[PDB]
Swiss-Prot record:
Activity regulation description: Inhibited by nitric oxide.
Subunit organization: Homodimer and homotrimer; in response to cyclic AMP or calcium; oligomerization is required for scramblase activity. Component of the mitochondrial permeability transition pore complex (mPTPC), at least composed of SPG7, VDAC1 and PPIF. Interacts with SPG7, NIPSNAP2 and SLC25A30. Interacts with hexokinases including HK1. The HK1-VDAC1 complex interacts with ATF2. Interacts with BCL2L1. Interacts with BAK1. Interacts with RTL10/BOP (via BH3 domain). Interacts with amyloid-beta and APP; induces VDAC1 dephosphorylation. Interacts with TMEM41B. Interacts with BCAP31.
Catalyzed reaction equations: chloride(in) = chloride(out); K(+)(in) = K(+)(out); ATP(in) = ATP(out); Ca(2+)(in) = Ca(2+)(out)
Impact reported for residue 12 to R: Decreased localization of SQSTM1/p62 to damaged mitochondria
Tissue: High levels of expression detected in heart, kidney, brain, and skeletal muscle. Not expressed in testis.
Site positions for Involved in ceramide and phosphatidylcholine binding. Critical for channel structural stability and gating: 73
Ligand binding (ATP): 12, 20
Residue numbers of Phosphothreonine PTMs: 19, 107
Stated name of the protein: Non-selective voltage-gated ion channel VDAC1
GO cellular component: membrane; membrane raft; mitochondrial inner membrane; mitochondrial nucleoid; mitochondrial outer membrane; mitochondrial permeability transition pore complex; mitochondrion; myelin sheath
Gene label: Vdac1
Entry-linked Pfam families: Porin_3 (PF01459)
Cross-link (Glycyl lysine isopeptide (Lys-Gly) (interchain with G-Cter in ubiquitin)): 12, 20, 53, 109-110, 161, 266, 274
Residues with Phosphoserine modification: 13, 193, 240
């Protein structure tokens, strides 16, 4: 509350208006279970309708919510395996420590990661270490909060190059109804977004992006309208003339069906246009 978001979550809500409720060029199938603690599973399948490629993943999660522990297991179709152990609020509130291991039989190439996070009133700090063969690399992030205002810094240091490869700044303003976010990545990529919860049923977002020193500008406008408690409409445009449309409908409790279309101007409908279908099952 007085506790700020992680550096990565700055601007998230506005990013969500653009990304959720759309899945162009995919048939997606998701099966989820919930539990406050103990076992939880998520299993997903994706057909890309341009490449005929069909992907799959499982994730198994066990929470010992008594000791702030989560153990997670991942497995996809590309043979990649992974395990993640997380401790949260355990040695100190709100300290979070993650150990992550990945393993790929298809190349015998394994990755290991440690993420540490520390959060309290006005401060959100992180330090992620990637033990890669051609790392370590270390990502550090700090976000400071002052009366709704937010300032963050994020860096990545690659030890093989012994150089900073990433240096990002963000400044924003965040209430429950309204969020401003600005960032510049590497003194080079500028971004800006406004998010508005306009009423109980309408959220809107504007995104701006440009690059030093190219005079052009990209922008998008998006909305999400919750028509009733069972149906939800999304519409977005950008200045490359792309129109995204999305409709999500609960067909039965626990079962949501989303249809989405991506349309190119001025060719609507004249040439080929991206459709999508998502079905989510929650049990």
């Amino acid at each position: 509350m007085a506790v700020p978001p992680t550096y990565a979550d700055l601007g998230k809500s506005a990013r969500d208006v653009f990304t959720k409720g759309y899945g162009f060029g995919l048939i997606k199938l998701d099966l989820k279970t919930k539990s406050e603690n103990g076992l939880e599973f998520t299993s997903s399948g994706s057909a890309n309708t341009e490449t005929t490629k069909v992907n799959g993943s499982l994730e198994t999660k066990y929470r010992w919510t008594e000791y702030g522990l989560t153990f997670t297991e991942k497995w996809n179709t590309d043979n990649t395996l992974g395990t993640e152990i997380t401790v949260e609020d355990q040695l100190a509130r709100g300290l979070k420590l993650t150990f992550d291991s990945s393993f790929s039989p298809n190349t015998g190439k394994k990755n290991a990661k440690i993420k540490t996070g520390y959060k309290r009133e006005h401060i959100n700090l992180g330090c992620d270490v990637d033990f890669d063969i051609a790392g370590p690399s270390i990502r550090g992030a700090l976000v400071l909060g002052y009366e709704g205002w937010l300032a963050g810094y994020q860096m990545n240091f690659e030890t093989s190059k012994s150089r900073v490869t990433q240096s990002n700044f963000a400044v924003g303003y965040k209430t429950d109804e309204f969020q401003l976010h600005t960032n510049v990545n590497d003194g080079t990529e500028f971004g800006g977004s406004i998010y508005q919860k306009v009423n109980k049923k309408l959220e809107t977002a504007v995104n701006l992006a440009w690059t030093a020193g190219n005079s052009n500008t990209r922008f998008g406008i998006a909305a999400k309208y919750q028509v009733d408690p069972d149906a939800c409409f999304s519409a977005k445009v950008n200045n490359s003339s792309l129109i995204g449309l999305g409709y999500t409908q609960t067909l039965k409790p626990g079962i949501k069906l989303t249809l989405s279309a991506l349309l190119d101007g001025k060719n609507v409908n004249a040439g080929g246009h991206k459709l999508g279908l998502g079905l989510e099952f929650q049990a």
